[PDB]
Swiss-Prot record:
Highly expressed in testis. It comes from the Eukaryota. Residues 9-113 form the Bromo domain. Scaffold subunit of various histone acetyltransferase (HAT) complexes, such as the MOZ/MORF and HBO1 complexes, that acts as a regulator of hematopoiesis. Plays a key role in HBO1 complex by directing KAT7/HBO1 specificity towards histone H3 'Lys-14' acetylation (H3K14ac), thereby promoting erythroid differentiation. It is found in: Nucleus; Chromosome. Component of some HBO1 complex composed of KAT7/HBO1, MEAF6, ING4 and BRD1/BRPF2. Component of the MOZ/MORF complex composed at least of ING5, KAT6A, KAT6B, MEAF6 and one of BRPF1, BRD1/BRPF2 and BRPF3. Interacts (via PHD-type zinc finger domain) with unmodified histone H3. Interacts (via PWWP domain) with dimethylated and trimethylated 'Lys-79' on histone H3. It comes from Homo sapiens (Human). This is Bromodomain-containing protein 1. There is a cross-link at K41 (Glycyl lysine isopeptide (Lys-Gly) (interchain with G-Cter in SUMO2)). The chain holds residues 555 to 674 of 1058 of the full protein.
Length: 121
């Protein structure tokens, strides 16, 4: 149907905008601390601590399959990156501190993303 095509075009355009958002957020992680999944070979107890691991590569795979239906879903995954790190790692660590800085800098990007999503529909 044409209605299904139009819905698919909207999903495509949202995907484009989320890819730009994802790039901008990942730039706020210049140390690449959040670039890849925590390795269960290197941190074998991780899943006893963190029930829903997340990282930028994992988000990028979901995005490229058009797996985010709305901005809320995308934000959920970004917040997992930050919140998982702030639980597993202590306050005095470079990991925790990177997460705080990513959260604070990313908030700015996400504030304008939300306006764009709503504005363009």
């Amino acid at each position: 149907s044409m209605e299904q095509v139009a819905m698919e075009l909207r999903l495509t355009e949202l995907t484009r905008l989320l890819r730009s958002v994802l790039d901008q957020l990942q730039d706020k992680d210049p140390a690449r601390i959040f670039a890849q999944p925590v390795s269960l070979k290197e941190v074998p107890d991780y899943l006893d601590h963190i029930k829903h691991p997340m990282d930028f590569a994992t988000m990028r795979k979901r995005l490229e399959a058009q797996g985010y239906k709305n901005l809320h879903e995308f934000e959920e995954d970004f917040d997992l990156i930050i919140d998982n790190c702030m639980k597993y790692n202590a306050r005095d660590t470079v990991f925790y501190r990177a997460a705080v800085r990513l959260r604070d800098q990313g908030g700015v990007v996400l504030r304008q993303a939300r306006r764009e999503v709503d504005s363009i529909g």
